[PDB]
Structure 1
């Protein structure tokens, strides 16, 4: 059982383009992109927790990591989209 992000990227693609397929090499590229962005944001949040003498990682560290790594307007929409999920889960 080899772990990947296959079906989640596929359902995101079906959300944004219900009649468009995807190839295996493009799927591997998308998987590498998701892993790379997850690694960058998690490493930045770990550094943010380390500089502030905090032993925990919360939504504030991930939010500051998104605001630092993602450039410009992409950050502020991503920051918007995430706060919403945490809100839903907390109510949920």
Structure 2
């Protein structure tokens, strides 16, 4: 059978930041666990947000507010940036 994983995307993002840096196996795993974690967390709060508001759709709106709620100050900042940025690029 098969087992998905973010590993591949991680490596990609690696070399765009440290062109010449390798990453341990155990290390890659931790990076994956990390991703899934965060994923579940944002996805989670977003779920709640919608429910609270008797809404039935999770949208960038939710993902954002969510991110504000989940991430620390400065971190949250950029996070929203990259955020709205990918959605602008995508639409236009």
1:2 positional shift: 1.2
1:6 positional shift: 1.0
Residues 1-92 of structure 1 mapped to structure 2, 5 A cutoff: 1-91=2-92
In the alignment, structure 2 segments of 5+ residues that lack a partner are: none
Consecutive aligned runs of 4 or more in structure 1 exceeding 3 Å deviation: none
Equivalent-residue separation in structure 2 for 1:74 and 1:46 (angstroms): 22
State the Cα deviation string for residues 9-38 of structure 1 (Å, max 9, x = none): 001001000000001100000000000000
Equivalent-residue separation in structure 2 for 1:54 and 1:24 (angstroms): 42
Equivalent-residue separation in structure 2 for 1:40 and 1:2 (angstroms): 21
TM-score normalised by length of structure 2: 0.97
In the alignment, structure 1 segments of 5+ residues that lack a partner are: none
State the Cα deviation string for residues 56-78 of structure 1 (Å, max 9, x = none): 01100000010000011100111
CA RMSD of aligned residues (A): 0.5
Aligned residue pairs total: 91
